[PDB]
């Protein structure tokens, strides 16, 4: 059950390349693709993310409308490891413009990408689906990425589409048009993904500044958090054990209504590393569920958990994990819905990430995520009521009507999440 990974745009390829550095290490794959690890859990499900002279190649497609960031990946630590024909890029760039990524610049390049997708999918014994990394605030990841998702769905309508989508924030902003690009993209995701991990740059910044006490956070700091999250959230897909998860079971079990498939991840311990005191299982469980540990700037106490999946990594007391997990629900039963029984599930994996003797990762489908879409909707509306900056988009062929419909669809989404916060 192979996954095809696609990373698109600047953010997409930066957090993408970090994801491959991190899990390649966890599976014992060195920058040159040769396996030099010491355990066999490492190779048992390696084919979920790697193709196979007994070298392993990420099943990864690297996409961007300008060659810069992908020159950086090819020069980076693990750059040698990607299949050279899987780099697919243009020269023009997307100017932080959804319309250029989705309708003009990106349209020119998307068929080349689908040829590489198709070739990877053919060498698949049984394709699970796709995992895309991208931001929603730019032009290539946002506009071209959602165009890819649509073209992929049309060619593989019975496969799962999974995204790690970085949501923009004024606290870590490149351009004023980010709310426009993000609102246009959310609309695409509501319709064409089965699971979207909301990685909120506002939450990552807050975590870097308050908890990690980094007063001048870089994208490198933010990406350290995203890397740790992507590893933990994919653990049960890549490692054998008790529960061997996959993308379709993820969606069946976490998504009670097809549009509410936007998840808040959480991670513990949060680190910038520098500490050798390993945490007790009680502490992992306490921090992981603390708001200060979630990668979407939403207050879970403002909403309710529909479904939760937790994974603990390292060597530790299974009996103590179950006890603490059951403790958190039985102590805050108000924040779990009554009409989905037994909606919190817990897994364990013996293999900890790097630099940590034990960790915990949390996948949550919480109605509090509506706060993130409200925030974006407010920022969108502040400009759109004056039609500010719209000429960047109408110059590419778009009409205002399309913005109005995207605003409407996202407000509907917020409404639907509130409907089940009061059920």
């Amino acid at each position: 059950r192979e996954i095809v990974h696609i990373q698109a745009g600047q953010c997409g390829n930066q957090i993408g390349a970090k994801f491959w550095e991190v899990i390649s290490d966890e599976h014992g794959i060195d920058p040159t693709g040769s396996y030099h690890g010491d355990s066999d859990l490492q190779l048992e499900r390696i084919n979920v993310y790697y193709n196979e002279g007994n070298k392993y190649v990420p099943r990864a497609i690297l996409v961007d409308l300008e060659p810069g960031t992908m020159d950086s990946v090819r020069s980076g630590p693990f750059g040698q490891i990607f299949r050279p024909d899987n780099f697919v890029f243009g020269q023009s760039g997307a100017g932080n413009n959804w319309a250029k990524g989705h309708y003009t610049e990106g349209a020119e390049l998307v068929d080349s990408v689908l040829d590489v997708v198709r070739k990877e999918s053919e060498s698949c014994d049984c394709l699970q689906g796709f995992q895309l990394t991208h931001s929603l605030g730019g032009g290539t990841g946002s506009g071209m990425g959602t165009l890819l998702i649509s073209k992929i769905r049309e060619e593989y309508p019975d496969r799962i589409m999974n995204t790690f989508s970085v949501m923009p924030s004024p606290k870590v902003s490149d351009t004023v048009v980010e709310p426009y690009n993000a609102t246009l993209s959310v609309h695409q995701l509501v319709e064409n993904t089965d699971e979207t991990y909301c990685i909120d740059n506002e939450a990552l910044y807050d975590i870097c500044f308050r908890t990690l006490k980094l007063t001048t956070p870089t994208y490198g700091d933010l990406n350290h958090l995203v890397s740790a999250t992507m590893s933990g959230v994919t653990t049960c897909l890549r490692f054998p054990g008790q529960l061997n998860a996959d993308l379709r079971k993820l969606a069946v079990n976490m998504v009670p209504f097809p549009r509410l498939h936007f998840f808040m991840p959480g991670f513990a311990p949060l680190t910038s590393s520098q500490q050798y005191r390993a945490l007790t299982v009680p502490e992992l469980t306490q921090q992981m569920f603390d708001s200060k540990n979630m990668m979407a700037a939403c207050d879970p106490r403002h909403g309710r958990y529909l479904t939760v999946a937790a994974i603990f990594r390292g060597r530790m007391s299974m009996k103590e994990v179950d006890e603490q997990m059951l403790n958190v629900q039985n102590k805050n039963s108000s924040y779990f819905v009554e009409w989905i029984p037994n909606n919190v599930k817990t897994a364990v994996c013996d293999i900890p990430p790097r630099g940590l003797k034990m960790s915990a990762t949390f996948i949550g489908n919480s109605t509090a995520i509506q706060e993130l879409f409200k925030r974006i909707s407010e920022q969108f509306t502040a400009m759109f009521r004056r039609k500010a900056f719209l000429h960047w988009y109408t110059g590419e062929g778009m009409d205002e009507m399309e913005f109005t419909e995207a605003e409407s669809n996202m407000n509907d989404l917020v409404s639907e999440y509130q409907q089940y916060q009061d059920a």
Partner: protein, 440 residues
């Protein structure tokens, strides 16, 4: 890839072009013969400085530039000057008869004789580009060639290059530095005609630059050379992101996304610091906080106006030299508690920051001190319409009597073009009012 072609029109544009290309060469280590010893790829390459310089197989680094004037004597000084060997003779284009301070002659009578040649030379430069990004057009508002020929050229560039981006550096007239009486007419005519053809225009008020030279450099009567060296430092700050790269570098096109909220509202206000004499720079190091603070002081604006009396729709800080984001963020935190920085209610209030690490240079033997860090702020403020109001008022004074209008009618123009241009300016001024009004 990402080449920019510069076009220098009339005396102002050409002389500022002299200053800019001299400064670029010093910043990049290019000698007056065009050799660049640090550049190990002979005859080509994709380095950041190749956006502005092409390369010959003989190792010469050639400005992607055309110099055009309808009289020869200013370009002749380029042809015979220190950097004569930089340019191919075909990049320097001259007529024999200038436009006599008359937009009509620059746009029509004289300009129409040379426009096809100018466009053919520009096409020759464009053909050497693998990914042309756009044009940078340098010119005065007030001269006959700077106003009238530039508008003709811009109209033709839109036809020949579609919506390919065109940026202007436009010299706004000030009585202090010499100036024809009809310069308000030429200014309104060219502003009206170029408005739809330009994507972004950096106005430079000769009085602002004159004042900065007198006040900061202690020069009693600044020359054109004084003014143009200061102007080239601002131009260099603005183009530095195109010509250098670095981890904290932010491309001018990304700033432009923030700076232009509506097509016509495309006139950013530039402020630069620090401008200081050698005597004062010696034993004084201006910190990040110090120079940042200087951007918010009106005395350091490129255009005379009062931003305290308008609203912001964007604020961009372009740093060069020894500057780390930690010091920037602190300086901005301080500024935001001590200054009148009011944004329109429909736009975010963050400052967009870029840092170019290559430190600033100065022309040896000039008046500007060499500093370790500098900053150019680009803001979009409704206050810049004060500059249009001032020019529209001088226009109206003369136009109500039709003074000098016969010199334009004699060249084939109609009064209809005057009132249509003036009405366009009136609508521009009303545009700046409307965008500053709070949302319902």
């Amino acid at each position: 890839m990402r080449e920019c072609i510069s076009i220098h029109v009339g005396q102002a544009g050409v002389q500022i072009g002299n200053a800019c290309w001299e400064l670029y060469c010093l910043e990049h280590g290019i000698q007056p013969d065009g050799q660049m010893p640090s550049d190990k790829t002979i005859g080509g390459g994709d380095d950041s400085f190749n956006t502005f310089f092409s390369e010959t197989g003989a190792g010469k680094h050639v400005p992607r530039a055309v110099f055009v004037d309808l009289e020869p004597t200013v370009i002749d000084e380029v042809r015979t000057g220190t950097y004569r060997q930089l340019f191919h003779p075909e990049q320097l284009i001259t007529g024999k008869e200038d436009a006599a301070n008359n937009y009509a002659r620059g746009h029509y009578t004289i300009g129409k004789e040379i426009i096809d040649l100018v466009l053919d030379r520009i096409r020759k430069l464009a053909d050497q580009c693998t990914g042309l990004q756009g044009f940078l057009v340098f010119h005065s508002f007030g001269g006959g060639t700077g106003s009238g020929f530039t508008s003709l050229l811009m109209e033709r560039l839109s036809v020949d290059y579609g919506k390919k981006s065109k940026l202007e550096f436009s010299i706004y007239p000030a009585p202090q530095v010499s100036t024809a009486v009809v310069e308000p007419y030429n200014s309104i005519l060219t502003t009206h005609t170029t408005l739809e053809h330009s994507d972004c225009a950096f106005m430079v008020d000769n009085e602002a630059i004159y004042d900065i030279c007198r006040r900061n450099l202690d020069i009693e009567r600044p020359t054109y050379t004084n003014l143009n060296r200061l102007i080239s430092q601002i131009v260099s700050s603005i183009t530095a992101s195109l010509r250098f790269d670095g981890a904290l570098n932010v491309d001018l096109t990304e700033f432009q996304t923030n700076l232009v909220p509506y097509p016509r509202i495309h006139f950013p206000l530039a402020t630069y610091a620090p401008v200081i004499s050698a005597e004062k720079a010696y034993h004084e190091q201006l910190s990040v906080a110090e120079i940042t603070n200087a951007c918010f002081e009106p005395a350091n604006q490129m255009v005379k106006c009062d931003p305290r009396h308008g609203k912001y729709m964007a604020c961009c800080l372009l740093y060069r030299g020894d500057v780390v984001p930690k010091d920037v963020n602190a300086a901005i935190a301080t500024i935001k508690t001590k200054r009148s920085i009011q944004f329109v209610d429909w736009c975010p209030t963050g400052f967009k920051v870029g840092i170019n690490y290559q430190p600033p240079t100065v022309v040896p033997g000039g008046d500007l001190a060499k500093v370790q860090r500098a900053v150019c702020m680009l803001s979009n403020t409704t206050a810049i319409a004060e500059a249009w109001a001032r020019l529209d008022h001088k226009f109206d004074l003369m136009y109500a009597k039709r003074a000098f209008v016969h010199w334009y009618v004699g060249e084939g123009m109609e009064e209809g073009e005057f009132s249509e241009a003036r009405e366009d300016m009136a609508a521009l001024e009303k545009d700046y009012e409307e965008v500053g009004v709070d949302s319902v």
